[PDB]
Amino acid sequence: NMYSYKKIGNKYIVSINNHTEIVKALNAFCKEKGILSGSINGIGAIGELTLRFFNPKTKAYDDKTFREQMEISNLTGNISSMNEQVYLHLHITVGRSDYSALAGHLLSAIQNGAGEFVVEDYSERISRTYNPDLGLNIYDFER
Template sequence: MWTSLIMIVLMLAIFVVPAVIIVYLVNKWINTKKQNQETQVKDKDIILSLANHSEIMSSLEAYCKGKDLKAGLISGIGAVNSATLRFFDPQTKKYVDKTFSEQMEIANLTGNISMLDGKVYLHLHVTLGRDDYSTIAGHLLSATVNGACELSIRKIDKVLNRKFDPEIGLNVYDF
């Protein structure tokens, strides 16, 4: 019995532990290569490529926070393998969310960056192409890059604030 137990422990020490360490190190190396890439074309124009498998909204929000970007215009193309879109119902003043889990092309992503209650607020709409060449579109709540996501951002040298309008039920510009 003790011999079997010792053999199992030795097998774990010789094969499993090094394999786990190797997998950990490889994943760490891969994740360091999955960084967003950017280039500044002009003073106000930025080209941003989001990392594969990143979530678009959280990646873009983190980018804006890191660059202290409080206002801007966004457009983009790319591909995702899941997306949650929202549709606003003016009767109920609520969003209806729907998640799509399939490979889709970002035919168009457009929107803006502003501030709401002192935090970055992204207002993005997206048109997604399916493999049968049909499209779906709506307000983007979340999406996971699967391939590429190439964005063009035009910075605005002014803080654009938003406020909630209870009559409409939406966050609107507060000029």
């Protein structure tokens, strides 16, 4: 049990449990509800954050972990699939204790407070295809 939720039409209001890794939980939620595609938005507070910064020129990537209290001012992302497997693409903006903002591609975050997310289910297959030139999985609406 990583969350509780309420279904309202095509949306789920998801309350993630405290001290839970949010990305793991959102993936679990989408797998347990069989969500094909959709959006994820929300807010909350965290005690750990890992962001990834990808360099398209060299293909190097940097994963930075912050270990401090932060407020999620916005988590924005989408749901799709690859080979029928849930694929989340989530970005995030957070505020530190001095109100300065950090932002980027979200890999993980550990809740420390509330975690209030809206998951909209589009009920529609949306797939991605790996682009070997970019090293990225890009939307592919015709597959």
